[PDB]
Amino acid sequence: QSAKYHRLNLQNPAAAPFLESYKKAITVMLQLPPSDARNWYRNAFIHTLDCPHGNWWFVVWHRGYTGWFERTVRELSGDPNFAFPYWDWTALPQVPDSFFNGVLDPNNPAFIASYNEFYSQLSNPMSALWNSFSTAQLQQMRNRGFQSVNDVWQAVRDSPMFFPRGRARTLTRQNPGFDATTRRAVSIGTIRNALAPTDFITFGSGKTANHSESATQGILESQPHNNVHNNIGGFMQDLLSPTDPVFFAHHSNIDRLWDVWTRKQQRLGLPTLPTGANLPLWANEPFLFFIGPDGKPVAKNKAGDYATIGDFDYNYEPGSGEAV
Amino acid sequence: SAKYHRLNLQNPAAAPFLESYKKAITVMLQLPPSDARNWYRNAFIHTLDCPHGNWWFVVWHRGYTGWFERTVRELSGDPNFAFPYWDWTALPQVPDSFFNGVLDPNNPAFIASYNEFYSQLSNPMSALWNSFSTAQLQQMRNRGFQSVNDVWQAVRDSPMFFPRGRARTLTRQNPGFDATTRRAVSIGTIRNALAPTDFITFGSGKTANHSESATQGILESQPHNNVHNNIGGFMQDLLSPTDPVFFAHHSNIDRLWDVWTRKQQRLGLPTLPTGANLPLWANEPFLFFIGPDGKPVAKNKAGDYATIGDFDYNYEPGSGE
Ligand SMILES: [Cu+2]
Ligand SMILES: [Cu+2]
Ligand SMILES: [Cu+2]
Ligand SMILES: [Cu+2]
């Protein structure tokens, strides 16, 4: 409800200055040395190393990642009111024309142009990062199948996760629209189906032992989230997706739909989180890789710490699905 | 080892089965709707009882496809008939063969409008409703149906029925899947769909009854759901079996279940839900299937359809083997 910061619809004319502030922060982070954890690519690699896909940690990990990166964009933009505008793809089933302007477009020549240059710039920092990992961080890497930083590079190079200049997205300014399947995935009918569940797991995707495992998926993850990623193409179709600035507009919308669901559950007098014995299993999952606006590792390193918007202190301009 | 063989619909040896299928469709469109093997009576089994978004997905569909295969076998007069499968991984488009004659639900042999559909099916479906057992009425209540008119409300208002010219969105000239659906049927997605080593992760989430929604496995959420929706018209809603291609689609889904089961057996891992989950899954009532004699079937729990069993078919191997 009452909050200091406001995540606006990116089509809101009042959001236009925040998109300029975002451009300023991207330009800064592309120009930070990759020894700085707020370097644009260092930021993307948090997602490669730690993001949950296909499990009940999906919305809560993304709340933490987006909430920390918002503070970093706020700091480096010099815009003390900054909050991430959301992409309401239900209203706008296309890459926003605004995200083809300047450094919101990852084809912009300010971005690293090739895998060769990316590895040249990021290999020494990522090796130094690996060598600094705690016992607990190396266990998370083992859970994810990474025995060394070169396992991370194998997945980047071979997937591929990095896309060269001209291929940073499949969708273009001239042809920005979703295909029929992705239009149905973001449709108001699908959004209502996504919000309909009355238990956290059915809403938020399946229970697993650790957040690097795959389980069954909820509608929110499997339809609008996954199909928007894949339809955009390029970085957005794989685990270096936060290289594309539109990633945070996408996740601002996902987090808004979580906020909608939570308030709907509260209205029905139903639980807002996993219940009984599931709650501590879900809350105690280690999230060990988030970076604050000072470039330092964050203290709050359990999933449970990110269950509520809490100290991130934002709310949303209401968007698609609010009336549920 | 099996008596019947579900072939790839691109196999030259499947071409006679596509003609037999056309003959059975023509017959079932011309059966009175008092006959439970009438084409529309058959589609309504799916509207009344199909699970979507839970662990009963593959097993209910095995039962429905297996019974309807026997009905097509009987009414075609082809004693070797088995449903050819649509390997959309190999053929990411509506097969050109499914735009020929009554394989195309735009064919004028089909009922052309909702008004005629209701006129033909309302009295039979009302008589059917009034014949339901306490147990069948409980399944209807689980699904939110207190009356046959709740079923018609869902048909009319969704809508589930599509008029002549709109029976599919994809056409003979433009039969191809969009980029998202091509990815959903891609070999990479098929391998991901087969990768799970537990039934629930493979076959979608546990629920208390089969009319409830849960989390979904890759098999259901990507290739199954996206092919339905990309085709459009009948295939995007719960009168989907009105489109003959429904059974070619479900022959491929059932093949991928067979592939998964044999992969599990090779790894020495479970082929079904385990422990306390197994009886919950096996004992779910499936009370609406119709035999090739037009009679209600005796095998009326999910557990009866866990194996191919006396349906007695195997597959020509396809994508993901
Ligand atoms: Cu992610
Ligand atoms: Cu994402
Ligand atoms: Cu179905
Ligand atoms: Cu289906």
Numbering used by the authors:
A (entry chain A): 34 to 357
B (entry chain B): 35 to 355
What does the published report state?
Tyrosinases (EC.1.14.18.1) are bifunctional metalloenzymes catalyzing two sequential enzymatic reactions: hydroxylation of monophenols to o-diphenols (monophenolase activity) and oxidation of o-diphenols to the corresponding o-quinones (diphenolase or catecholase activity). The tyrosinase from the bacterium Verrucomicrobium spinosum (vsTyr) is produced as a pre-pro-enzyme in which a C-terminal extension serves as an inactivation domain. It does not require a caddie protein for copper ion incorporation, which makes it similar to eukaryotic tyrosinases. To gain an understanding of the catalytic machinery and regulation of vsTyr activity, we determined the structure of the catalytically active “core domain” of vsTyr by X-ray crystallography.
Crystals of the vsTyr core domain belong to the space group C2 containing two monomers per asymmetric unit. Despite reconstitution with CuSO4 after its purification, the initial crystal structure, determined by molecular replacement at 1.43 Å resolution, revealed that the copper sites were only partially occupied. Using the anomalous contribution of the Cu ions, occupancies of the CuA and CuB sites for the two copies of vsTyr per asymmetric unit could be estimated to be ~40% and ~80%, respectively. The lower occupancy observed for the A site may be caused by its proximity to His86, which belongs to a flexible loop. For vsTyr, the distances of 3.7 Å and 4.0 Å observed in the structures determined from unsoaked and CuSO4-presoaked crystals, respectively, fall within the 3.2–4.0 Å range that is characteristic for the met form. Interestingly, the increased metal site occupancy is the only noticeable difference between the two vsTyr core domain structures reported here. Their superposition results in a very low RMSD of 0.4 Å and identical crystal packing, hinting at the remarkable structural stability of the vsTyr core domain. The final models contain all amino acids of the crystallized construct, except for the C-terminal two (unsoaked) and three amino acids (soaked) in chains B, respectively.
